[PDB]
Amino acid sequence: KVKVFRAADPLVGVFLWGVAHSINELSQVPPPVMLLPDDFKASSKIKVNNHLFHRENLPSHFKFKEYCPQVFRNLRDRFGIDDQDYLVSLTRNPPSESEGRFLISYDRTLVIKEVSSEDIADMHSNLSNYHQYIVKCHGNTLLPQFLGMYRVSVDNEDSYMLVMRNMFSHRLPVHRKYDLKGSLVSREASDKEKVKELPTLKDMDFLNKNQKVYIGEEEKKIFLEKLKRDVEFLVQLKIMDYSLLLGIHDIIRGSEPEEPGEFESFIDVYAIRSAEGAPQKEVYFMGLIDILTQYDAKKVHPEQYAKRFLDFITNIF
Ligand SMILES: Nc1ncnc2c1ncn2[C@@H]1O[C@H](COP(=O)(O)OP(=O)(O)NP(=O)(O)O)[C@@H](O)[C@H]1O
Ligand SMILES: CC(C)c1ccccc1-c1nc(NCc2ccccn2)c2c(ccn2C)n1
């Protein structure tokens, strides 16, 4: 009559199965030092078909596809992520579902976003362009760090999943959250949004709260240098409607009790500390997103957008 209920979601369970399988398969294939053109058009497909052989945590009919496995393994290596840590981060403990289809890893190092067939097509277009860029900058970017790309099939229903390094902290929680475009038009969080514990604020909210960012000229000249060449790369690709995602962690408010002889096992690669002498001690998490890569459940000329965007972001400091 009504829909079926499960203790474990099928899609997620197949996904974590597939990642295990794919990293296991990859450990038996020496990583090339040089990627070839064909690697950007490569895929791994597996179809499981069990008759009358019933499992709890896993359906009986399902498919898993990994896109460009040698490319993403190479990206992981350039971003300083060993396949074993990736696998552990994603499978050891189950991932926490956040808001439609958007997952954080138990350790909070990785984010997993469901995306469209359309978005997979876009990913493939610029993947070789992106890999070239990552080589040039030695993985030092404010762009998303794409670590894997997969299609899960349950019920004859294809879900596309994208794995990214978390722009936010492996533990330091985020108190204030902005999406900034520097748009000619006004941008503001709805009444329905400011109603949430962590609402996605915007350009007018930032200005209306006279919000600034205090980091210190040296960490600023390091940030704006990187931001410029990242945005220049996006111009070459004729990409436009992107934002700076800005997370503020307030030091004094601190973390929940579940943060004696324990050191952080991960680095927050988009994090930058309050410089000495500043209204409040804080950590800033700043990276580049668009509608495709926004930390949310998926629902004018490039050079102008660029010049404009860099104008607005240079003024938040
Ligand atoms: N190598 C590729 N290069 C560019 N776009 C691709 C590539 N593979 C898939 N796409 C696109 O990405 C989206 C997802 O395609 P997908 O569901 O993987 O189809 P498929 O590979 O043609 N099917 P199948 O043979 O069953 O694996 C669609 O928009 C595809 O056209
Ligand atoms: C450079 C870009 C990150 C990228 C890398 C690898 C492979 C593909 C892409 C890409 N990224 C899109 N959006 C996501 C996005 C854009 C800007 C900033 C942050 N995130 C794309 C396309 C094509 C259309 N769109 C909307 N290509």
Numbering used by the authors: 37 to 135, 139 to 298, 344 to 383, 403 to 420
Please share text taken word for word from the publication where this structure appeared.
Phosphatidylinositol 5-phosphate 4-kinases (PI5P4Ks) are emerging as attractive therapeutic targets in diseases, such as cancer, immunological disorders, and neurodegeneration, owing to their central role in regulating cell signaling pathways that are either dysfunctional or can be modulated to promote cell survival. The regulation of mTORC1 by PI5P4Kγ results in the basal activation of the complex, whereas reduced PI5P4Kγ activity in starvation conditions initiates autophagy. PI5P4Kγ is therefore a target for small molecule inhibition in the context of neurodegenerative diseases.
Previous studies have shown that basal ATP turnover in the absence of PI5P is not inhibited by 1, suggesting inhibitors from this chemical series can bind to the protein simultaneously with a nucleotide. In an attempt to observe this phenomenon crystallographically, we set out to determine a ternary complex with PI5P4Kγ, 40, and the ATP derivative AMP-PNP.
